[PDB]
Amino acid sequence: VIKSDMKIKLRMEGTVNGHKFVIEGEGEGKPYEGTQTMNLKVKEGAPLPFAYDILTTVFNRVFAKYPKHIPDYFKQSFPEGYSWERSMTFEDGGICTARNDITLEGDCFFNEIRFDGVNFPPNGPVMQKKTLKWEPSTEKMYVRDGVLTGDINMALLLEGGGHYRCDFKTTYKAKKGVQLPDYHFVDHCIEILSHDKDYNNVKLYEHAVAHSGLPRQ
Amino acid sequence: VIKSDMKIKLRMEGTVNGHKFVIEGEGEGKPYEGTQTMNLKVKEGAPLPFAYDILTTVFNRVFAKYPKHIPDYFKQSFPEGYSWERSMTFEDGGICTARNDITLEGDCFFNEIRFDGVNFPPNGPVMQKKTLKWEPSTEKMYVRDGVLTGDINMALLLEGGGHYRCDFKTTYKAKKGVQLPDYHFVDHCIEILSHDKDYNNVKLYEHAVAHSGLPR
Amino acid sequence: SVIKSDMKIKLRMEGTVNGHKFVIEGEGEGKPYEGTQTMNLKVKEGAPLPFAYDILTTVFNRVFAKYPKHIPDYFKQSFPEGYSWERSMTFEDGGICTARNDITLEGDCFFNEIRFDGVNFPPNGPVMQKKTLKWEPSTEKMYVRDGVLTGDINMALLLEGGGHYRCDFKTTYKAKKGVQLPDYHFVDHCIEILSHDKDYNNVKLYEHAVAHSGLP
Amino acid sequence: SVIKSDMKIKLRMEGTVNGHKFVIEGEGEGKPYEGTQTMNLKVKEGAPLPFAYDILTTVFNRVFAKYPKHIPDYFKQSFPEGYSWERSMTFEDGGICTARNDITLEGDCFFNEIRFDGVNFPPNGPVMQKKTLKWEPSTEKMYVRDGVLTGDINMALLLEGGGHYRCDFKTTYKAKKGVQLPDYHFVDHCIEILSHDKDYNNVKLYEHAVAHSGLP
Numbered sequence: 001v002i003k004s005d006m007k008i009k010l011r012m013e014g015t016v017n018g019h020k021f022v023i024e025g026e027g028e029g030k031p032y033e034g035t036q037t038m039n040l041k042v043k044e045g046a047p048l049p050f051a052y053d054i055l056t057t058v059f060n061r062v063f064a065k066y067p068k069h070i071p072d073y074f075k076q077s078f079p080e081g082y083s084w085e086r087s088m089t090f091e092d093g094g095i096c097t098a099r100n101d102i103t104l105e106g107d108c109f110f111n112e113i114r115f116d117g118v119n120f121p122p123n124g125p126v127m128q129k130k131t132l133k134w135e136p137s138t139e140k141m142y143v144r145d146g147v148l149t150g151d152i153n154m155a156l157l158l159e160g161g162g163h164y165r166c167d168f169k170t171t172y173k174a175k176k177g178v179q180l181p182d183y184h185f186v187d188h189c190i191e192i193l194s195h196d197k198d199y200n201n202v203k204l205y206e207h208a209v210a211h212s213g214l215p216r217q
Numbered sequence: 218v219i220k221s222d223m224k225i226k227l228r229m230e231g232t233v234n235g236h237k238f239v240i241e242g243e244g245e246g247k248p249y250e251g252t253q254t255m256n257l258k259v260k261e262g263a264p265l266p267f268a269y270d271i272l273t274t275v276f277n278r279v280f281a282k283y284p285k286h287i288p289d290y291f292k293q294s295f296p297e298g299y300s301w302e303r304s305m306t307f308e309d310g311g312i313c314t315a316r317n318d319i320t321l322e323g324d325c326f327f328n329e330i331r332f333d334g335v336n337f338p339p340n341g342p343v344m345q346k347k348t349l350k351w352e353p354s355t356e357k358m359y360v361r362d363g364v365l366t367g368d369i370n371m372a373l374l375l376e377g378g379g380h381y382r383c384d385f386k387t388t389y390k391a392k393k394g395v396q397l398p399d400y401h402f403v404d405h406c407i408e409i410l411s412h413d414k415d416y417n418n419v420k421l422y423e424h425a426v427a428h429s430g431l432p433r
Numbered sequence: 434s435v436i437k438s439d440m441k442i443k444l445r446m447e448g449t450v451n452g453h454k455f456v457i458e459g460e461g462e463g464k465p466y467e468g469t470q471t472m473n474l475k476v477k478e479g480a481p482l483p484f485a486y487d488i489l490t491t492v493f494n495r496v497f498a499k500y501p502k503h504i505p506d507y508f509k510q511s512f513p514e515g516y517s518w519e520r521s522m523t524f525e526d527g528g529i530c531t532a533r534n535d536i537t538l539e540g541d542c543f544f545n546e547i548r549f550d551g552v553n554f555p556p557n558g559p560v561m562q563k564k565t566l567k568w569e570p571s572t573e574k575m576y577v578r579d580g581v582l583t584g585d586i587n588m589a590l591l592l593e594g595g596g597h598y599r600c601d602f603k604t605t606y607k608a609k610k611g612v613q614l615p616d617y618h619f620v621d622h623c624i625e626i627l628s629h630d631k632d633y634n635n636v637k638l639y640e641h642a643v644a645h646s647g648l649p
Numbered sequence: 650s651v652i653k654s655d656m657k658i659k660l661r662m663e664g665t666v667n668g669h670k671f672v673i674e675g676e677g678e679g680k681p682y683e684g685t686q687t688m689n690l691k692v693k694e695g696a697p698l699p700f701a702y703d704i705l706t707t708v709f710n711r712v713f714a715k716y717p718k719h720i721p722d723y724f725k726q727s728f729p730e731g732y733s734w735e736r737s738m739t740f741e742d743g744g745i746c747t748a749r750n751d752i753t754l755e756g757d758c759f760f761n762e763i764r765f766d767g768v769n770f771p772p773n774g775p776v777m778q779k780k781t782l783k784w785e786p787s788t789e790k791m792y793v794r795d796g797v798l799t800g801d802i803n804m805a806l807l808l809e810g811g812g813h814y815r816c817d818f819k820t821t822y823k824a825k826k827g828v829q830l831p832d833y834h835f836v837d838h839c840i841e842i843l844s845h846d847k848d849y850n851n852v853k854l855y856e857h858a859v860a861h862s863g864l865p
Contacts, residue, residue: 354647380576400589431641
């Protein structure tokens with residue numbers, strides 16, 4: 001049911017330090033190549049008073065290239081689909097919770113997202129919009145207590161060229177039982193390709209590739 | 218505007234590991250003595266599949282006995298009101314965010330609450346309902362970057378007698394500029410007085426007292 | 434009852450902070466049942482210390498804590514045999530310390546053999562730049578886990594200019610012999626450098642500590 | 650230039666885990682430009698070690714990592730003068746270790762002077778019960794903060810029964826002289842105990858490491 005080319009529709013409702021917003025997205029991706037692009041529009045709550053980058057990794061691991069030797073939990077989840085939940089703990093104490101329930105209808109993934117962020121300091125890089133991009137990252141995928149889990153040590157590049165660190169923990173749950181993978185990794189690169197002044201319109205891109213660990217030789 | 222006896226109305230909308238719920242609450246307490254009681258009713262999502270104890274400290278620091286020598290941020294915030302936001306990081310990776318916007322009308326406090334919890338392990342004490350109560354605690358209040366903040370190392374007493382740790386960080390913000398206090402403490406005690414089979418109905422009580430720490 | 438109203442204290446600390454080796458010796462006195470102690474500390478090697486002396490002070494004995502009759506006193510019951518403790522200190526900018534103290538008793542005098550190691554203090558942070566003023570008073574939570582008496586503290590250093598620098602302490606305490614374990618309780622602390630000379634080569638330190646059950 | 654295709658390695662570690670003192674000496678060889686090394690390690694003092702040997706193995710030199718031309722190799726450029734590193738290891742059950750290595754080069758041989766201290770390992774946890782099997786392969790994130798080259802790693806020990814035991818590593822690396830600092834990048838690692846005798850008195854260890862830019 002997952003074709004070489006697929007469409008994507010998304011709705012996020014969220015709050016950051018109490019500021020409510022809604023963002024809608026429409027995009028397309030190549031699940032077997034691990035690439036996807038989305039156009040995102042702020043529907044309610046503009047202008048967003050915080051760094052848009054905190055939202056972008058919340059805007060589907062179906063879009064990750066899996067080699068034959070690693071079970072692909074995500075593609076096997078369909079047609080029923082899966083959901084994930086995530087915590088994001090930034091090093092200055094800003095904390096976010098997020099969830100996405102992902103379904104498939106025809107050739108289009110639907111993503112129903114909730115995002116909430118708290119305790120971002122008023123003069124920190126998130127509330128002052130001082131971020132530039134996420135550095136490329138490697139997600140560690142493992143099974144704990146029967147739950148597929150990804151851990152990432154993420155870093156946002158800041159104005160000035162320093163970094164602002166974030167610990168991600170994501171739990172992934174297929175809607176029916178799926179063959180679980182062994183310990184593995186997924187490399188990611190995410191980029192805002194373009195945006196308008198206050199990020200009311202954003203074009204976003206991600207590439208992701210699963211792999212094993214470094215060999216002995 | 219804050220009287221010796223006040224009433225409290227609450228609505229909480231939340232999710233825990235994807236499960237939606239709504240809880241409404243009614244009560245009263247006594248502000249200047251720092252005590253409070255609430256009756257809480259589940260409206261949606263019954264039976265709650267998680268330990269009720271994760272919600273109880275989210276169900277107002279107005280209800281805290283403050284001495285003369287520490288400025289009382291919360292009482293001075295009214296009538297205009299205040300809000301707070303909180304992160305709760307449990308030792309097994311369960312993480313909650315929560316927020317309460319508090320306003321007053323006449324003499325009832327209205328509490329509008331959002332609560333979201335993620336990553337609670339399926340066989341941990343929260344999803345297995347193994348919690349007994351929160352241990353008494355001491356919140357540390359300090360100002361950082363102009364924001365009154367409270368830090369707490371919390372512990373839930375478990376079945377079997379062990380403890381399950383949670384680190385709280387709350388930021389408090391008045392709607393109008395209020396005098397900020399110096400570094401201090403607030404002692405807390407919170408109890409579920411009684412419940413029905415699946416905590417559809419709950420009677421809650423908190424006692425809280427502010428202080429400066431030793432020499433005293 | 435080998436623990437008397439007036440006790441003497443001797444101490445030797447060997448350690449490292451960001452690779453810098455030092456030795457400090459101390460001689461002091463205390464009142465175990467009043468929960469007070471004072472020590473004179475002298476740098477023997479590693480002068481002048483290139484880091485904030487405050488990071489060391491809580492490492493320079495819970496025998497010196499006033500325990501009320503209703504909470505078992507693990508520390509006083511540890512003697513004559515003694516006890517040891519181990520500690521981690523996790524500062525919010527990523528500086529991390531490990532410390533241990535082996536405590537013995539000869540006549541009226543406690544001997545303390547201490548190791549201390551601190552790593553990853555940022556070169557322009559408050560520790561390596563000596564911006565600290567004092568530790569705020571604190572409350573340690575005492576509990577038993579995996580059969581080990583453990584103390585957790587959320588500590589804060591007051592900084593020049595009025596901010597705070599936070600540190601998470603976890604201490605494990607082990608009597609040489611089986612000693613009755615207390616239930617969950619608290620110890621309030623206050624620690625002060627009373628005086629010091631230029632480079633903290635000579636320091637006089639004081640601590641006051643009192644155990645309690647909390648609210649009530 | 651001073652670093653050849655084949656180099657020898659000598660090592661001495663002095664340490665203490667939960668108060669237990671030990672000394673281990675190593676001798677080995679490696680291929681710095683291929684990113685590989687092997688060492689034989691012998692317990693000299695403190696046998697039989699009462700904790701999981703796997704906690705020591707990543708302490709037993711980033712010279713042995715293959716660096717592509719487009720990423721500056723801080724470690725090889727540190728020689729002949731050398732470099733040192735400090736590390737914290739925070740295990741998910743509260744065990745915390747600090748470690749340091751001062752690395753020098755004499756002729757064709759690296760010398761490593763190591764200190765290791767661990768505290769607060771639970772008596773029934775996988776370290777004290779020796780239930781660890783191996784470290785999973787990892788990716789170290791290298792970045793420069795405050796002008797200090799730092800590596801962050803989210804490490805995991807595979808356990809008997811198939812679970813994992815997580816450890817957060819932070820290492821800071823400091824050349825003796827000023828060396829060109831690299832941009833943000835990654836180092837993949839694989840470390841394996843190739844063999845060992847009873848109680849790990851004699852151990853052969855292997856590591857492979859490669860630096861890269863990650864995706865694309």
